[PDB]
């Protein structure tokens, strides 16, 4: 399983740095007991030698994370950008990728990653909804991100 | 649905380099992760290191300790398998494999298990 | 690491036996973890079961894997001259992948 809770979305304000958003999409899982009280900056220190930026066709997608032995549960955290912030292309292009959701993955088995960036492309696949995240409020984007995972692997 | 096509087969002196190709096939190659397990003759399997192509993320077996490199070649779906400071211990058939995949296209569900493997290199080194 | 231990060494049975093969575990893994390979001389492995219980696509329903936490089993309920091989079971549960040593399944005559 993995645990998806209504405060792990969020919408982050304008003028926000890398650190401060990956920063912010910590703080629920660290206060729920997901991942150890390091996690921010083990998750800091991959983007910066290992980005994870993903030039996704309607809007910019990140997925930082870290390794498995500083998770203790499985979870994930989202974040909506007010503002296009640049993450550096995961593919290796010298230019990075304007990225407005960020999906912030905290899983337990190295292995498993390919899994999960199978049920990002679940909701990566509808570009109509990629359009609604921006404009959806916290517990809209919630709901339909709940019950499109929901599909297949059990939440919560 | 894929096809892992590896080089051929090698001989080489204790203490020289060995790099293994693989070239995928048809299938995403950066959504799913490659593997290296090799073979002993007469042995059983020992897995080396794993890849994801698409964040270039690659997970190492701790034996080896830095002995072995793992990368992947987006552009024209090959990974390679680099092995230095060779001993007379690592003669073995050197087996590309990819992860299973329930379902076809873009969508196939990764299984975690290998699926699809490929013909395997003999690499024997001996002076 | 998961240290895996598979019993028998070698079975010996004749056609129309049912075999079963034991892999131990030192460490409780995930059943979504755990796989059962099939190599016949000269070949590379093939994936019989995965997530423990799953058959891979195109393997006779007369393979079976089960069990889970550190007791993993694959059975075969009537054996068949292309079943004679080595089986290897394996898991990569906590960012590792281990084998077992074999096992292999032999005609009895």
């Known amino acids: 399983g993995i645990h998806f809770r209504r405060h792990y979305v969020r919408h982050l304000p304008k003028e926000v740095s890398q650190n401060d958003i990956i920063k912010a999409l910590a703080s629920p899982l660290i206060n729920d007991g997901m991942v150890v009280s390091d996690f921010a900056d083990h998750v800091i220190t991959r983007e910066q030698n290992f980005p994870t930026g993903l030039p996704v066709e309607p809007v910019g997608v990140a997925i930082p994370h870290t390794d498995s032995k500083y998770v203790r549960q499985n979870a994930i955290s989202v974040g909506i950008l007010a503002e296009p912030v640049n993450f550096e292309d995961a593919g290796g292009e010298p230019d990075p990728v304007p990225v407005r959701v960020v999906f912030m993955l905290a899983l337990g088995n190295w292995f498993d990653i390919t899994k999960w960036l199978w049920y990002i492309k679940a909701v990566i696949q509808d570009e109509d909804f990629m359009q609604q995240l921006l404009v959806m409020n916290d517990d809209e984007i919630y709901q339909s991100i709940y019950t499109r995972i929901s599909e297949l692997e059990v939440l919560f | 649905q894929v096809q892992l096509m590896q080089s051929g087969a090698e001989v080489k002196r204790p203490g020289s380099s060995v790099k293994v190709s693989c070239k995928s096939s048809?299938?995403?190659?950066?959504?799913?992760?490659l593997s290296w397990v090799r073979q002993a003759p007469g042995q059983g399997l020992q897995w080396m290191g794993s890849?994801?192509?698409?964040?270039?993320?690659?997970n190492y077996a701790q034996r080896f300790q830095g002995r072995v490199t793992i990368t992947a070649d987006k552009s024209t779906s090959t990974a390679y398998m680099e092995l230095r400071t060779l001993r007379p211990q690592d003669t073995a058939v050197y087996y590309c494999?990819?992860?299973?995949?329930?379902?076809?296209?873009?969508?196939?569900?990764?299984?975690?298990?290998?699926?699809?493997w490929g013909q395997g290199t003999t690499v024997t080194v001996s002076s | 690491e998961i240290v895996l231990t598979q019993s028998p060494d070698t079975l010996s049975l004749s056609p129309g036996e049912r075999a079963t093969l034991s892999c131990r575990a030192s460490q409780s893994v995930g059943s979504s973890y755990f796989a059962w390979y099939q190599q016949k001389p000269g070949q590379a492995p093939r994936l019989l079961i995965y997530?423990?219980?799953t058959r891979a696509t195109g393997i006779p329903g007369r393979f079976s894997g089960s069990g889970s936490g550190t007791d993993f089993t694959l059975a075969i309920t009537r054996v068949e001259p292309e079943d004679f091989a080595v089986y290897y079971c394996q898991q990569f549960d906590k960012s590792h992948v281990t084998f077992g040593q074999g096992t292999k399944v032999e005609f009895k005559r």
């Open positions: 048809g299938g995403s190659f950066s959504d799913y992760t």
């Open positions: 997530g423990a219980s």
């Open positions: 494999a990819r992860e299973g995949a329930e379902g076809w296209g873009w969508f196939a569900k990764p299984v975690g298990a290998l699926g699809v």
């Open positions: 890849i994801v192509p698409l964040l270039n993320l690659v």
